[PDB]
Design an enzyme around this catalytic site. Structure first.
Site, short mmCIF file in Angstrom:
data_model
loop_
_atom_site.label_atom_id
_atom_site.label_comp_id
_atom_site.label_asym_id
_atom_site.label_seq_id
_atom_site.Cartn_x
_atom_site.Cartn_y
_atom_site.Cartn_z
N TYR A 24 35.79 39.97 27.83
CA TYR A 24 36.56 41.28 27.93
C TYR A 24 37.76 41.47 28.87
CZ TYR A 24 33.02 43.38 24.75
OH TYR A 24 32.27 43.43 23.74
N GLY A 26 41.46 40.85 29.70
CA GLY A 26 42.48 40.57 28.77
C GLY A 26 42.36 41.04 27.52
N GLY A 28 41.81 42.92 24.14
CA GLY A 28 40.55 43.18 23.13
C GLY A 28 39.20 42.84 23.98
N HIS A 44 36.69 49.04 31.55
CA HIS A 44 38.27 49.24 31.90
C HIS A 44 38.76 49.36 30.48
CE1 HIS A 44 42.48 47.86 32.51
NE2 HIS A 44 42.28 48.77 33.60
N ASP A 45 38.17 48.55 29.44
CA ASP A 45 38.85 48.87 27.89
C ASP A 45 38.38 50.27 27.56
OD1 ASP A 45 39.78 46.14 28.19
OD2 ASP A 45 38.27 45.49 26.71
N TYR A 48 40.77 52.72 29.13
CA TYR A 48 41.89 52.94 28.38
C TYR A 48 41.84 53.58 26.97
CZ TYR A 48 45.16 49.98 31.55
OH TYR A 48 45.76 49.48 32.72
N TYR A 63 52.72 53.30 37.30
CA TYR A 63 52.30 54.28 38.33
C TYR A 63 52.72 53.69 39.68
CZ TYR A 63 48.12 50.95 38.24
OH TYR A 63 47.34 49.95 38.40
N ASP A 88 42.52 51.80 36.39
CA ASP A 88 42.72 50.36 37.14
C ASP A 88 42.09 50.27 38.60
OD1 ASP A 88 44.50 49.97 34.83
OD2 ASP A 88 46.24 49.58 35.91
CA LIG Z 1 39.80 43.60 27.27
CL LIG Z 2 35.87 53.28 33.58
#
Ligand SMILES: [Ca+2]
Ligand SMILES: [Cl-]
Ligand SMILES: [Cl-]
Ligand SMILES: [Cl-]
Ligand SMILES: [Cl-]
Ligand SMILES: [Cl-]
Ligand SMILES: [Cl-]
Ligand code: NA
Length: 121
Positions: A24, A26, A28, A44-45, A48, A63, A88
């Site tokens: 996960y 990087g 995709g 994190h993906d 986003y 940011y 992040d």
């Molecule tokens: Ca990813």
């Molecule tokens: Cl999250």
């Protein structure tokens, strides 16, 4: 760049040591995460994706942030920038929390080794 700088400050590692880790971390992702650090990237993906659904462009947002003894402080002119920082921040904190099980063998992990189902967000 920003997330990379946050990763370095929070983990003691180079950014590139998280930029392609597991299934996960990087661009995709698919299949089952290899370990807790990889789960940080799965989450994190997802984070986003939520930002994209709100009209933000988190892959492009720039940011501001500071790191003191009190933690990570996020900032930015727009709400989308601040949201990107929050995603992040959560991931960089997750990386730090899981330093104990970080395994160098999962850096630059060949994607063919990713197997199993894909967890939902
Ligand atoms: Ca990813
Ligand atoms: Cl999250
Ligand atoms: Cl795990
Ligand atoms: Cl700072
Ligand atoms: Cl914090
Ligand atoms: Cl290791
Ligand atoms: Cl290491
Ligand atoms: Na707003």
């Amino acid at each position: 760049v920003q997330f990379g700088v946050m990763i370095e400050k929070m983990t003691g590692k180079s950014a590139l040591q998280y930029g392609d880790y597991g299934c996960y971390c990087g661009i995709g992702g698919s299949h089952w995460p290899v370990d807790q650090t990889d789960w940080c990237c799965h989450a994190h993906d997802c984070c986003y994706g939520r930002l994209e659904k709100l009209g933000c462009e988190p892959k492009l947002e720039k940011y501001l942030f500071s790191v003191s003894e009190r933690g990570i402080f996020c900032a930015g002119r727009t709400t989308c920038q601040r949201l990107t920082c929050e995603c992040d921040k959560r991931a960089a904190l997750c990386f730090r929390r899981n330093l104990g099980t970080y395994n160098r063998k999962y850096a630059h992990y060949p994607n063919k080794l990713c197997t199993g189902p894909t967890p939902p967000c």
